[PDB]
Amino acid sequence: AKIEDIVELPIKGVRAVQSDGQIMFLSENGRFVISGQIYDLWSKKPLNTMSQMRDVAERIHFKSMGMDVDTLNTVSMGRGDKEVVVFVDPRCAVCHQLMGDAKSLVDDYTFKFIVIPALGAESNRLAKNLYCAKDKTHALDALMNNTLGSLPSKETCDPGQYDQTLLTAHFIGIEGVPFVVAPDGRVSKGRPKNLKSWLESAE
Amino acid sequence: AKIEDIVELPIKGVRAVQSDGQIMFLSENGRFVISGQIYDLWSKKPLNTMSQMRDVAERIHFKSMGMDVDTLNTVSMGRGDKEVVVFVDPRCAVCHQLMGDAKSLVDDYTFKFIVIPALGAESNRLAKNLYCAKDKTHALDALMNNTLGSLPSKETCDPGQYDQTLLTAHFIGIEGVPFVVAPDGRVSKGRPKNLKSWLESA
């Protein structure tokens, strides 16, 4: 079918409100009320309960969206059976500290560090260097020690999976780094106060 | 009864989208779609057509939303049967020039100049002087000529630091100055190309 018309409404935010056992949707300044059903097009499912609302507010479920982080600009650290995803910029010192804190938790978690240029032009050069590196053995170390500018490039580098990393970040709305997703899907916008306890719930 | 639970949704904007004869509501990132009915609690009416959607996006109907502009930090000009509302900052020269254009149209319109201190600390000083003025007879001239600082203040006025008019304007979505609302509700963000013809429609 065709899309006949679009109008941007003066709405800057929306909250789900439960009263009388039914869930309505109120714009943030209390101007508009929407009575109806909400559908999550990323998971392709309707949201019928406040737990489900809380879930889209608080978490990201990469598998439900059919997204495999191992195909992206990623370097893994650890061997634990619980997966932690962290979007990071090569030039972000807060990211480096987080990666440092992560080193003490490698027995219980496997950290997937997805390297994106969130901080400008120089970050993109370094993120591409990591992407096109013939030897990725020390790419993780280079990431942590900030020596990414001096790594050997592959003979043939195919940027398809690098473009997808930037696309993935734009799609899910990454506005800053570090961006952390816990094994249960909970999201941290920034460095959590205590990574270890934060990973253990709730927050 | 009670509101048992509330959740802030990860939504920054909503578009009304018309397709296949139904209007749905879509989040800015295309993630959420809401099928249902929307209601404007300020004007107390449902919105069922795209014309009505376009209306809340493009127009402001003060009487319909229950706002009396005369209760705010306002100064009036003219005697015409059609009401024009203009949000202005005391230091905005373009606002002053628009008021100049308006003097030649006072038989046909009555102008409500709503003064908001949007442009800093000095703007806020001058707006308080108007608010706390004992005599508002010459308020219009001081506004046009930027001499509000020399208006006689009432004995003891304590308005707080946060101007209510700016708060009201910011809330209903007044963006920048000059901000013009025509008699039929149409808005201009900034000084219109030609005020006289713009007031007469689009």
GROMACS .gro file of C-alpha atoms in nm:
model
  405
    1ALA     CA    1   0.000   0.000   0.000
    2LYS     CA    2   0.100   0.365  -0.048
    3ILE     CA    3   0.165   0.636   0.216
    4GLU     CA    4  -0.068   0.922   0.127
    5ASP     CA    5   0.022   1.191   0.386
    6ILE     CA    6   0.243   1.266   0.684
    7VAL     CA    7   0.222   1.535   0.954
    8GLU     CA    8   0.467   1.584   1.234
    9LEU     CA    9   0.267   1.634   1.553
   10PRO     CA   10   0.383   1.869   1.828
   11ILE     CA   11   0.489   1.575   2.052
   12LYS     CA   12   0.838   1.554   2.213
   13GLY     CA   13   0.778   1.246   2.429
   14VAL     CA   14   0.536   0.971   2.515
   15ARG     CA   15   0.444   0.779   2.831
   16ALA     CA   16   0.236   0.465   2.878
   17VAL     CA   17  -0.011   0.508   3.162
   18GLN     CA   18  -0.218   0.229   3.316
   19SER     CA   19  -0.555   0.304   3.468
   20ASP     CA   20  -0.866   0.087   3.497
   21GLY     CA   21  -0.659  -0.206   3.369
   22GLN     CA   22  -0.613  -0.033   3.033
   23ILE     CA   23  -0.295   0.126   2.902
   24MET     CA   24  -0.322   0.470   2.729
   25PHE     CA   25  -0.048   0.688   2.583
   26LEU     CA   26   0.001   1.045   2.698
   27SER     CA   27   0.236   1.295   2.531
   28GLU     CA   28   0.498   1.423   2.778
   29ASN     CA   29   0.351   1.762   2.838
   30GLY     CA   30   0.001   1.608   2.900
   31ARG     CA   31  -0.153   1.763   2.588
   32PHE     CA   32  -0.249   1.455   2.385
   33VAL     CA   33  -0.397   1.121   2.482
   34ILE     CA   34  -0.380   0.827   2.241
   35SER     CA   35  -0.613   0.531   2.302
   36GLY     CA   36  -0.506   0.222   2.106
   37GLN     CA   37  -0.250  -0.050   2.052
   38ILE     CA   38   0.135  -0.007   2.022
   39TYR     CA   39   0.352  -0.229   1.810
   40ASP     CA   40   0.723  -0.270   1.826
   41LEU     CA   41   0.836  -0.294   1.467
   42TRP     CA   42   1.194  -0.398   1.568
   43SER     CA   43   1.076  -0.708   1.751
   44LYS     CA   44   0.761  -0.723   1.534
   45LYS     CA   45   0.530  -0.771   1.829
   46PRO     CA   46   0.252  -0.584   2.006
   47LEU     CA   47   0.314  -0.444   2.358
   48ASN     CA   48   0.024  -0.525   2.585
   49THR     CA   49   0.163  -0.492   2.936
   50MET     CA   50   0.358  -0.238   3.135
   51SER     CA   51   0.638  -0.498   3.177
   52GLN     CA   52   0.670  -0.489   2.801
   53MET     CA   53   0.672  -0.111   2.795
   54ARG     CA   54   0.941  -0.111   3.068
   55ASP     CA   55   1.131  -0.356   2.858
   56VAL     CA   56   1.149  -0.129   2.547
   57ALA     CA   57   1.231   0.161   2.771
   58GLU     CA   58   1.517  -0.020   2.957
   59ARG     CA   59   1.656  -0.290   2.727
   60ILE     CA   60   1.778  -0.390   2.382
   61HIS     CA   61   1.750  -0.749   2.257
   62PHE     CA   62   1.985  -0.794   1.965
   63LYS     CA   63   1.880  -1.149   1.871
   64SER     CA   64   1.512  -1.054   1.856
   65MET     CA   65   1.610  -0.792   1.603
   66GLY     CA   66   1.813  -1.048   1.409
   67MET     CA   67   2.142  -0.866   1.477
   68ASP     CA   68   2.465  -1.061   1.522
   69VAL     CA   69   2.733  -0.842   1.678
   70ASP     CA   70   3.009  -1.085   1.583
   71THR     CA   71   2.968  -0.983   1.213
   72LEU     CA   72   3.041  -0.617   1.299
   73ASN     CA   73   3.360  -0.419   1.378
   74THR     CA   74   3.408  -0.624   1.698
   75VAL     CA   75   3.683  -0.753   1.919
   76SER     CA   76   3.596  -0.995   2.201
   77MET     CA   77   3.748  -1.018   2.551
   78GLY     CA   78   3.681  -1.291   2.811
   79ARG     CA   79   3.550  -1.645   2.820
   80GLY     CA   80   3.237  -1.640   3.043
   81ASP     CA   81   2.900  -1.772   2.906
   82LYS     CA   82   2.722  -1.435   2.958
   83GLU     CA   83   2.758  -1.183   2.672
   84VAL     CA   84   2.819  -0.812   2.731
   85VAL     CA   85   2.808  -0.570   2.431
   86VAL     CA   86   2.984  -0.235   2.451
   87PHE     CA   87   2.991   0.027   2.180
   88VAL     CA   88   3.310   0.224   2.210
   89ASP     CA   89   3.512   0.497   2.032
   90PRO     CA   90   3.895   0.452   2.004
   91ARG     CA   91   3.950   0.802   2.150
   92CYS     CA   92   3.709   0.778   2.442
   93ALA     CA   93   3.901   0.756   2.777
   94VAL     CA   94   3.582   0.662   2.963
   95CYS     CA   95   3.557   0.369   2.724
   96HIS     CA   96   3.918   0.270   2.808
   97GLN     CA   97   3.848   0.270   3.182
   98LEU     CA   98   3.544   0.056   3.119
   99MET     CA   99   3.753  -0.184   2.916
  100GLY     CA  100   3.996  -0.176   3.208
  101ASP     CA  101   3.725  -0.262   3.459
  102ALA     CA  102   3.613  -0.536   3.223
  103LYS     CA  103   3.948  -0.716   3.256
  104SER     CA  104   3.863  -0.823   3.611
  105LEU     CA  105   3.541  -0.999   3.491
  106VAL     CA  106   3.663  -1.206   3.202
  107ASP     CA  107   3.600  -1.532   3.390
  108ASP     CA  108   3.219  -1.456   3.408
  109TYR     CA  109   3.160  -1.253   3.092
  110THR     CA  110   3.261  -1.230   2.732
  111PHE     CA  111   3.276  -0.864   2.629
  112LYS     CA  112   3.199  -0.768   2.267
  113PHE     CA  113   3.362  -0.430   2.200
  114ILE     CA  114   3.204  -0.277   1.887
  115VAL     CA  115   3.431  -0.001   1.766
  116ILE     CA  116   3.252   0.304   1.617
  117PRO     CA  117   3.360   0.658   1.525
  118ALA     CA  118   3.131   0.846   1.761
  119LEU     CA  119   3.379   1.129   1.827
  120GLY     CA  120   3.478   1.246   1.479
  121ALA     CA  121   3.705   1.213   1.180
  122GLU     CA  122   4.018   1.082   1.354
  123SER     CA  123   3.810   0.816   1.535
  124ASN     CA  124   3.695   0.686   1.194
  125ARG     CA  125   4.054   0.642   1.072
  126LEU     CA  126   4.142   0.443   1.382
  127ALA     CA  127   3.818   0.239   1.373
  128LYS     CA  128   3.892   0.155   1.004
  129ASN     CA  129   4.251   0.062   1.092
  130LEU     CA  130   4.118  -0.195   1.342
  131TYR     CA  131   3.867  -0.315   1.082
  132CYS     CA  132   4.123  -0.366   0.801
  133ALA     CA  133   4.397  -0.514   1.022
  134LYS     CA  134   4.559  -0.825   0.880
  135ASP     CA  135   4.654  -0.931   1.230
  136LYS     CA  136   4.371  -0.889   1.481
  137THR     CA  137   4.561  -1.068   1.756
  138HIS     CA  138   4.674  -0.740   1.909
  139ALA     CA  139   4.388  -0.524   1.778
  140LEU     CA  140   4.226  -0.547   2.125
  141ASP     CA  141   4.556  -0.440   2.289
  142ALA     CA  142   4.599  -0.162   2.033
  143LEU     CA  143   4.243  -0.050   2.115
  144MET     CA  144   4.319  -0.040   2.484
  145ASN     CA  145   4.667   0.108   2.447
  146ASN     CA  146   4.560   0.357   2.180
  147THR     CA  147   4.809   0.239   1.914
  148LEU     CA  148   4.548   0.174   1.645
  149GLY     CA  149   4.698   0.419   1.396
  150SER     CA  150   4.996   0.181   1.340
  151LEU     CA  151   4.838  -0.156   1.239
  152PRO     CA  152   4.895  -0.350   0.911
  153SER     CA  153   4.603  -0.342   0.660
  154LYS     CA  154   4.464  -0.645   0.474
  155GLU     CA  155   4.545  -0.689   0.106
  156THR     CA  156   4.179  -0.661   0.021
  157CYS     CA  157   3.948  -0.483   0.262
  158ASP     CA  158   3.573  -0.505   0.206
  159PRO     CA  159   3.395  -0.225   0.398
  160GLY     CA  160   3.050  -0.391   0.388
  161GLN     CA  161   3.066  -0.501   0.754
  162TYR     CA  162   3.209  -0.170   0.864
  163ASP     CA  163   2.925   0.027   0.704
  164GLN     CA  164   2.687  -0.208   0.882
  165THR     CA  165   2.848  -0.119   1.218
  166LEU     CA  166   2.778   0.250   1.165
  167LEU     CA  167   2.424   0.161   1.041
  168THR     CA  168   2.361  -0.062   1.345
  169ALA     CA  169   2.468   0.225   1.574
  170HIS     CA  170   2.240   0.475   1.391
  171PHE     CA  171   1.951   0.224   1.386
  172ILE     CA  172   1.942   0.162   1.762
  173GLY     CA  173   2.005   0.526   1.834
  174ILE     CA  174   2.357   0.535   1.985
  175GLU     CA  175   2.408   0.898   2.102
  176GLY     CA  176   2.724   0.846   2.302
  177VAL     CA  177   2.981   0.599   2.423
  178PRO     CA  178   3.033   0.385   2.603
  179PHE     CA  179   2.702   0.221   2.530
  180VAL     CA  180   2.656  -0.100   2.729
  181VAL     CA  181   2.408  -0.380   2.686
  182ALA     CA  182   2.394  -0.638   2.976
  183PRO     CA  183   2.338  -1.010   2.905
  184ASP     CA  184   1.968  -0.968   2.999
  185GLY     CA  185   1.941  -0.675   2.761
  186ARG     CA  186   1.955  -0.383   3.003
  187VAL     CA  187   2.118  -0.071   2.858
  188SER     CA  188   2.363   0.172   3.020
  189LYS     CA  189   2.404   0.509   2.851
  190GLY     CA  190   2.755   0.584   2.974
  191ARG     CA  191   2.986   0.413   3.216
  192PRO     CA  192   2.799   0.239   3.496
  193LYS     CA  193   2.900   0.338   3.851
  194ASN     CA  194   3.000  -0.019   3.930
  195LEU     CA  195   3.012  -0.245   3.628
  196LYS     CA  196   3.022  -0.571   3.821
  197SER     CA  197   2.713  -0.505   4.031
  198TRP     CA  198   2.534  -0.342   3.740
  199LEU     CA  199   2.583  -0.655   3.527
  200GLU     CA  200   2.440  -0.863   3.812
  201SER     CA  201   2.109  -0.664   3.781
  202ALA     CA  202   1.872  -0.479   3.826
  203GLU     CA  203   1.981  -0.193   3.801
  204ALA     CA  204  -0.960   0.593   3.975
  205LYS     CA  205  -0.582   0.568   4.010
  206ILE     CA  206  -0.292   0.552   3.771
  207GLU     CA  207  -0.125   0.228   3.882
  208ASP     CA  208   0.183   0.252   3.664
  209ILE     CA  209   0.372   0.487   3.431
  210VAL     CA  210   0.654   0.422   3.184
  211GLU     CA  211   0.847   0.675   2.986
  212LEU     CA  212   0.869   0.539   2.631
  213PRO     CA  213   1.184   0.584   2.415
  214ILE     CA  214   1.004   0.820   2.177
  215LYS     CA  215   1.117   1.169   2.080
  216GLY     CA  216   0.846   1.252   1.827
  217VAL     CA  217   0.524   1.134   1.670
  218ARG     CA  218   0.409   1.162   1.311
  219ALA     CA  219   0.047   1.109   1.197
  220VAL     CA  220   0.070   0.876   0.895
  221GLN     CA  221  -0.225   0.817   0.658
  222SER     CA  222  -0.230   0.491   0.461
  223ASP     CA  223  -0.500   0.267   0.315
  224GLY     CA  224  -0.766   0.503   0.459
  225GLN     CA  225  -0.642   0.478   0.819
  226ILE     CA  226  -0.427   0.723   1.017
  227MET     CA  227  -0.163   0.564   1.242
  228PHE     CA  228   0.089   0.727   1.469
  229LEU     CA  229   0.461   0.659   1.411
  230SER     CA  230   0.767   0.733   1.632
  231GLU     CA  231   1.053   0.946   1.486
  232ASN     CA  232   1.283   0.644   1.433
  233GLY     CA  233   1.009   0.434   1.269
  234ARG     CA  234   1.023   0.192   1.561
  235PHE     CA  235   0.678   0.223   1.720
  236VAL     CA  236   0.341   0.242   1.551
  237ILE     CA  237   0.029   0.315   1.748
  238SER     CA  238  -0.310   0.225   1.593
  239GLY     CA  239  -0.585   0.416   1.762
  240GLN     CA  240  -0.743   0.752   1.837
  241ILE     CA  241  -0.588   1.078   1.948
  242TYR     CA  242  -0.738   1.341   2.156
  243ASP     CA  243  -0.633   1.698   2.225
  244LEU     CA  244  -0.694   1.765   2.587
  245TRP     CA  245  -0.610   2.135   2.555
  246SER     CA  246  -0.891   2.207   2.305
  247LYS     CA  247  -1.092   1.907   2.427
  248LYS     CA  248  -1.162   1.752   2.093
  249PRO     CA  249  -1.072   1.433   1.908
  250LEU     CA  250  -0.848   1.447   1.594
  251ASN     CA  251  -0.972   1.221   1.310
  252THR     CA  252  -0.853   1.384   0.986
  253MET     CA  253  -0.517   1.480   0.846
  254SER     CA  254  -0.647   1.839   0.827
  255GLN     CA  255  -0.684   1.838   1.199
  256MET     CA  256  -0.333   1.693   1.243
  257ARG     CA  257  -0.193   1.968   1.013
  258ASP     CA  258  -0.397   2.214   1.220
  259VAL     CA  259  -0.237   2.131   1.557
  260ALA     CA  260   0.106   2.129   1.388
  261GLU     CA  261   0.069   2.459   1.201
  262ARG     CA  262  -0.176   2.662   1.408
  263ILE     CA  263  -0.250   2.786   1.760
  264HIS     CA  264  -0.612   2.857   1.867
  265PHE     CA  265  -0.590   3.046   2.194
  266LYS     CA  266  -0.961   3.074   2.263
  267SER     CA  267  -1.013   2.709   2.184
  268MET     CA  268  -0.732   2.599   2.421
  269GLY     CA  269  -0.866   2.822   2.701
  270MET     CA  270  -0.580   3.072   2.713
  271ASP     CA  271  -0.650   3.442   2.759
  272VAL     CA  272  -0.349   3.634   2.624
  273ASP     CA  273  -0.461   3.949   2.808
  274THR     CA  274  -0.367   3.777   3.142
  275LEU     CA  275   0.001   3.757   3.040
  276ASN     CA  276   0.270   4.027   3.018
  277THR     CA  277   0.092   4.183   2.720
  278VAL     CA  278   0.059   4.524   2.559
  279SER     CA  279  -0.216   4.592   2.301
  280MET     CA  280  -0.214   4.811   1.987
  281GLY     CA  281  -0.500   4.896   1.752
  282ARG     CA  282  -0.879   4.887   1.744
  283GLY     CA  283  -0.950   4.635   1.461
  284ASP     CA  284  -1.197   4.347   1.492
  285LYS     CA  285  -0.938   4.085   1.407
  286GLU     CA  286  -0.691   3.977   1.669
  287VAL     CA  287  -0.320   3.929   1.593
  288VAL     CA  288  -0.088   3.781   1.857
  289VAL     CA  289   0.287   3.849   1.844
  290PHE     CA  290   0.546   3.705   2.083
  291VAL     CA  291   0.839   3.946   2.114
  292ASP     CA  292   1.161   4.000   2.311
  293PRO     CA  293   1.228   4.358   2.431
  294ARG     CA  294   1.572   4.370   2.268
  295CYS     CA  295   1.474   4.218   1.932
  296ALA     CA  296   1.510   4.486   1.666
  297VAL     CA  297   1.331   4.277   1.407
  298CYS     CA  298   1.042   4.253   1.657
  299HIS     CA  299   1.037   4.639   1.677
  300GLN     CA  300   1.031   4.676   1.298
  301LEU     CA  301   0.741   4.432   1.278
  302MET     CA  302   0.556   4.654   1.529
  303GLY     CA  303   0.634   4.946   1.301
  304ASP     CA  304   0.473   4.766   1.008
  305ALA     CA  305   0.172   4.696   1.239
  306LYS     CA  306   0.101   5.066   1.306
  307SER     CA  307  -0.019   5.102   0.949
  308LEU     CA  308  -0.278   4.822   1.007
  309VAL     CA  309  -0.447   4.919   1.339
  310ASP     CA  310  -0.788   4.993   1.186
  311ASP     CA  311  -0.814   4.636   1.059
  312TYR     CA  312  -0.642   4.442   1.345
  313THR     CA  313  -0.584   4.457   1.715
  314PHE     CA  314  -0.228   4.352   1.802
  315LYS     CA  315  -0.142   4.160   2.122
  316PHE     CA  316   0.233   4.194   2.181
  317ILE     CA  317   0.325   3.924   2.433
  318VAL     CA  318   0.662   4.005   2.586
  319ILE     CA  319   0.889   3.715   2.673
  320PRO     CA  320   1.251   3.751   2.796
  321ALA     CA  321   1.398   3.477   2.574
  322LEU     CA  322   1.729   3.643   2.486
  323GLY     CA  323   1.912   3.668   2.819
  324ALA     CA  324   1.966   3.858   3.144
  325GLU     CA  325   1.918   4.211   3.011
  326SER     CA  326   1.597   4.104   2.828
  327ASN     CA  327   1.474   3.965   3.158
  328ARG     CA  328   1.543   4.294   3.336
  329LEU     CA  329   1.339   4.496   3.087
  330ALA     CA  330   1.048   4.249   3.087
  331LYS     CA  331   1.022   4.269   3.467
  332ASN     CA  332   1.012   4.653   3.441
  333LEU     CA  333   0.710   4.628   3.215
  334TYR     CA  334   0.542   4.373   3.441
  335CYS     CA  335   0.603   4.585   3.752
  336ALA     CA  336   0.506   4.911   3.579
  337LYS     CA  337   0.264   5.137   3.767
  338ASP     CA  338   0.172   5.324   3.449
  339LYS     CA  339   0.136   5.117   3.129
  340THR     CA  340   0.004   5.407   2.919
  341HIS     CA  341   0.334   5.449   2.735
  342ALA     CA  342   0.435   5.081   2.748
  343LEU     CA  343   0.388   5.027   2.375
  344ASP     CA  344   0.630   5.308   2.278
  345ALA     CA  345   0.899   5.195   2.524
  346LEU     CA  346   0.871   4.846   2.377
  347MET     CA  347   0.925   4.967   2.019
  348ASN     CA  348   1.207   5.204   2.115
  349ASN     CA  349   1.378   4.987   2.381
  350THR     CA  350   1.323   5.220   2.678
  351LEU     CA  351   1.140   4.983   2.917
  352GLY     CA  352   1.412   5.045   3.177
  353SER     CA  353   1.274   5.395   3.218
  354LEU     CA  354   0.917   5.299   3.315
  355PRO     CA  355   0.776   5.383   3.657
  356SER     CA  356   0.770   5.068   3.867
  357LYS     CA  357   0.493   4.993   4.118
  358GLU     CA  358   0.572   5.013   4.491
  359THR     CA  359   0.706   4.661   4.567
  360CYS     CA  360   0.671   4.403   4.291
  361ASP     CA  361   0.833   4.058   4.362
  362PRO     CA  362   0.778   3.849   4.047
  363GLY     CA  363   1.036   3.578   4.115
  364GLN     CA  364   1.320   3.510   3.869
  365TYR     CA  365   1.123   3.289   3.630
  366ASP     CA  366   0.882   3.490   3.414
  367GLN     CA  367   0.544   3.314   3.388
  368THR     CA  368   0.481   3.441   3.037
  369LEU     CA  369   0.801   3.282   2.908
  370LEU     CA  370   0.705   2.963   3.096
  371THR     CA  371   0.357   2.969   2.932
  372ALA     CA  372   0.502   3.044   2.586
  373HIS     CA  373   0.770   2.778   2.614
  374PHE     CA  374   0.509   2.521   2.723
  375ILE     CA  375   0.262   2.586   2.435
  376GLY     CA  376   0.552   2.571   2.190
  377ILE     CA  377   0.642   2.928   2.107
  378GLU     CA  378   0.986   2.902   1.933
  379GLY     CA  379   1.201   3.210   1.889
  380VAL     CA  380   1.097   3.574   1.821
  381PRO     CA  381   0.915   3.738   1.663
  382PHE     CA  382   0.650   3.468   1.676
  383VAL     CA  383   0.331   3.564   1.500
  384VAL     CA  384  -0.019   3.415   1.531
  385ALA     CA  385  -0.273   3.532   1.273
  386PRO     CA  386  -0.651   3.571   1.346
  387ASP     CA  387  -0.719   3.230   1.186
  388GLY     CA  388  -0.444   3.069   1.397
  389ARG     CA  389  -0.168   3.041   1.134
  390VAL     CA  390   0.181   3.085   1.278
  391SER     CA  391   0.491   3.261   1.148
  392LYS     CA  392   0.824   3.164   1.313
  393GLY     CA  393   0.997   3.496   1.262
  394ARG     CA  394   0.906   3.812   1.076
  395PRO     CA  395   0.686   3.734   0.778
  396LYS     CA  396   0.796   3.827   0.423
  397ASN     CA  397   0.503   4.067   0.396
  398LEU     CA  398   0.301   4.112   0.715
  399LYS     CA  399  -0.007   4.271   0.559
  400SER     CA  400  -0.054   4.002   0.293
  401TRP     CA  401   0.058   3.725   0.527
  402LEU     CA  402  -0.212   3.827   0.776
  403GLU     CA  403  -0.468   3.810   0.495
  404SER     CA  404  -0.389   3.431   0.451
  405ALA     CA  405  -0.146   3.193   0.275
   0.00000   0.00000   0.00000
